[PDB]
Amino acid sequence: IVGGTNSSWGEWPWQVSLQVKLTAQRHLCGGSLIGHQWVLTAAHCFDGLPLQDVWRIYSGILNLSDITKDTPFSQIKEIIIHQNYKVSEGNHDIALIKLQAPLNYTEFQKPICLPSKGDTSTIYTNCWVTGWGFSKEKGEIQNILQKVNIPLVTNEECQKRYQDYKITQRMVCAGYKEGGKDACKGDSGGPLVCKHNGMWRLVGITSWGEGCARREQPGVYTKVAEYMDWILEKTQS
Ligand SMILES: N[C@@H]1COc2cc(C(=O)N3C[C@@H](c4ccccc4)C[C@H]3C(=O)Nc3cccc(Cl)c3)ccc21
Ligand SMILES: *SC[C@H](NC(=O)CC[C@H](N)C(=O)O)C(=O)NCC(=O)O
């Protein structure tokens, strides 16, 4: 996250860190807890070799530097990538992770609400993006979970900024005309959440953008509302 600030405990209890343990262990992507046994993330997080028994999913963690060998983590039972996803493209950048064991809910480990049927994106005026990604374009993973307030952008405006790509109805963009605040490398797969009727809703999954926090180059997010039929089908309700 560029231009954000430190989060506090319990502010974003659905945020998870997707890490890979080879000989070293590294954070690679964000994700969002959506139920006891389900995480929603970006399909591009899985573009590498599909190695078995390497992913560790950390929840209930605010500071990655607080993770030790004794810190509990979830493991992957199944990865469900959207059927129309292609590696060389940004479309359908969404994946479900089924965990090997259900997590119990706590103040620091609980699900984001999925968007409600029949809600236009213009109802969302208070939106935030979170993660442990770079705080500048040539930066590094951040220890304390960062947060930044960000306005949603119209699909017409977002398309104007990315004329070499197709910004579809299944995408939502967010950012500032003057840049300065944005998600960045290592934030992809995490949440874009907007607070409505006292509850946070998962509006986007951090996906892509040209650089980070550049002028007139907003972040592009997978629009979760446009994948609700798919999410419900794959989670068997
Ligand atoms: N500023 C916009 C809004 O939020 C963004 C998020 C990303 C982003 O994090 N990634 C773009 C993703 C990607 C998608 C499609 C095609 C190509 C790349 C791969 C992933 C990424 O670089 N991860 C990464 C890189 C180095 C180290 C580590 Cl640990 C993780 C990039 C740009 C923006
Ligand atoms: S919609 C998903 C989260 N809600 C619940 O899990 C229900 C909580 C109580 N049992 C209740 O109110 O009935 C949720 O609200 N997450 C987003 C948030 O703002 O916390």
Curated annotation (Swiss-Prot):
Cystines in this chain: C29-C45, C127-C194, C158-C173, C184-C212
Residues at the catalytic site: H44 (charge relay system), D93 (charge relay system), S188 (charge relay system)
Domain Peptidase S1: 1-236
Effect caused by changing C158Y: In PKKD; likely pathogenic; may strongly affect protein expression
Residues the record marks as carrying a glycan: N6, N63, N104
Name under which the protein is recorded: Plasma kallikrein light chain
Organism annotation: Homo sapiens (Human)
Lineage of producing organism: Eukaryota, Metazoa, Chordata, Craniata, Vertebrata
